[PDB]
Amino acid sequence: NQVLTKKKLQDLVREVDPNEQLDEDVEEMLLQIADDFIESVVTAACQLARHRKSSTLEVKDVQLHLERQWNMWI
Amino acid sequence: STPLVDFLMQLEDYTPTIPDAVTGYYLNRAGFEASDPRIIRLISLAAQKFISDIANDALQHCKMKKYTLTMEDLTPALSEYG
Amino acid sequence: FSEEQLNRYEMYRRSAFPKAAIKRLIQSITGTSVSQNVVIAMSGISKVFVGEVVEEALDVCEKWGEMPPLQPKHMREAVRRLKSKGQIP
Amino acid sequence: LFSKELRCMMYGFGDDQNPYTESVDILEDLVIEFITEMTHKAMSI
Amino acid sequence: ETFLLQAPLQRRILEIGKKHGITELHPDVVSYVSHATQQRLQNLVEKISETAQQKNFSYKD
Amino acid sequence: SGIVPQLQNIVSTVNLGCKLDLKTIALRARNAEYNPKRFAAVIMRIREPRTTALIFSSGKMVCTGAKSEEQSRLAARKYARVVQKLGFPAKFLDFKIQNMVGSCDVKFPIRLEGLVLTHQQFSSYEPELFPGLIYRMIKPRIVLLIFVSGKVVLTGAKVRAEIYEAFENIYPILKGFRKT
Amino acid sequence: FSLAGFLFGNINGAGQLEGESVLDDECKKHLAGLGALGLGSLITELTNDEGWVRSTEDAVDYSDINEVAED
Amino acid sequence: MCESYSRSLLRVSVAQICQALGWDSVQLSACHLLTDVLQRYLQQLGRGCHRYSELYGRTDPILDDVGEAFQLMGVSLHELEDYIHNIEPVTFP
Amino acid sequence: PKDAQMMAQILKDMGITEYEPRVINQMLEFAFRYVTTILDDAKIYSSHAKKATVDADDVRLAIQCRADQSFTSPPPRDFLLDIARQRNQTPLPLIKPXXXXXXX
Known part of the structure; x- marks a missing residue:
């Protein structure tokens, strides 16, 4: 069913801002839009794995979608 | 002595170089209406410092081949949203 | 001050990467010979990167309640956070 | 490549004197691809 | 260390890949997909901290 | 020692x-x-x-x-x-x-940054330019290069006694700035 | 002429270091750096296929002299 | 044909900043594009201020709102004091 | 030059008459710069395919990604879903005082 617990979300939220009057349903809407972002990352990873005509997802495809999004460093 | 809030207080004393009517009009297209001209002063002088930092990058790359702004100098200026 | 702060700031001060491996990686990416000043600059900028990473990992660790040694989730969470703030490209 | 010298760099910024070697391998990866993309940006100019 | 749920998300990634021709994956790389997702959530949380400073509006200053 | x-x-x-x-x-x-x-x-x-x-x-x-x-x-x-x-x-x-250079190892690492903070009238230290500390001793007039492995390089002497005296002078300060 | 290595042990004067013992490469690189920072006073105290010094045909090896010259 | 006068005045301001910096010659199209970048940056500052200020029930833009708008868009504010002492006694309005 | 003639052919295909030539030339220059960004994407997906050539599939996934970027539109299936959602709700409460109109 779901692919993310509420526990890790609330851990990061009260990790960053513990003393905030923050509501609950806001956070589930954030989780739903985050799962839609997961589906977008899956679509981009399938496209960039169909790029090299292989059948195994690797570091380079994820890294290029990150260069579209964040420009990470691993 | 907290000079930033002292700067915000002494904003009433400055006189800009960009015409405040023109900055006000381009903020009217951007929907911004301040009867207090101090925010207009702040935005104008900050845009001047934006141009100054871009042209300083162009000047530091201008020493690499009296001074001329070039497409070579425009290339490190594209680092922000180029 | 304390003895451990002594040991930790000295291990700060003289940590540096081996010139052989930095030269090997830059010559296995460029494909030509590179000057040794490039190795100095690349090891220094890499040290700045590692330092920002470990500091953010400490921030993660202490804000998670947990205590050091830093775990893979802490360091990787930290480089991630340094990318999220628009501070590393 | 860096597993012994980077551990002495992991401790120097506030981690333990014997950190987890998993983080040492990850941080070695961080270093390798860091140098890689920095080199790619350096050659481009 | 397993931020998202690795098994059902990994099954869905393999499902959508096999529907488009991708047989396999690599495990820590899919954990890294989860990993960039969880700080996509903290990019939202940095915006949450900005709105919390918006909640810190001192109108009696 | x-x-x-x-x-x-x-x-x-x-x-x-x-x-x-x-x-x-x-x-x-x-x-x-x-x-x-x-x-x-x-x-x-x-x-x-x-x-x-x-x-x-x-x-x-x-x-x-x-x-x-x-x-x-x-x-x-x-x-x-x-x-x-x-x-x-x-x-x-x-x-x-005309000039003499020797070298030795004290077998412990040394705080150079604390040394330049506490002996600023005798030393100077910039990490990015040169990682070793330059210690300009007056009696005798000896220039020293101090490293983290413990290696100390002593230069500028006209006789062997100035090298030995310079290391015997700097060594208790180095014990005061040891790693343990 | 930059004799920073000349105090440090076995250079030619051009700036290439030799050694019976082996120092670290930080010594040689940062020695080329050391020429500025204050070693210059002691320097002033102390003073390729196409690159080969020409010699006469009957030139002698004087490296292996075993005699003693007068005091 | 009347909006072009304010564009020319912004070009004059760019030329005055280049006079303060000391540029002899310049590619003209680069300055026209940089005046376009100025007008787009001013409009981005304005849009950021409105999107920050409509989260209040009222409309009034305060100085701390605009300061946080610059810190959102990456501006270190302290040097603004030094920058005015660079500019306003040296460049004539 | 020739690009003004090409834009003249475009605007004759558009059927509407009056323009300015500076708008036309800036459309030209920004359009060629979008073309060069497509070519930069072609460089990227040639480098990550480890081939010196630019394939047709390079153009295909490049235009798929840039149609995902700046070619947005509202979905008609999502339009029907929002239609069912909002039109299923038939609430309309009426109060005596209606001078108040805010609840931010």
């Missing part, structure tokens, strides 16, 4: 007492280097002791490479004999040791 600084170089000078034709020396001797557009002196090497001399046209000659004074005097006498055997009436006038 049980750490003795081991000598790495003694640098000497001598006057041969006669004007020298450097081109004749460069053409007739083997293992000689002479490039007047870049360096006005003959660069010569000999193997026992493994030493290197710089020979001027005026007759003064400057010597490198020995780890003891007798080896430097023997080497300088040998280069003077190279000058002598080519037909020149070389002498051996006013020999003097």
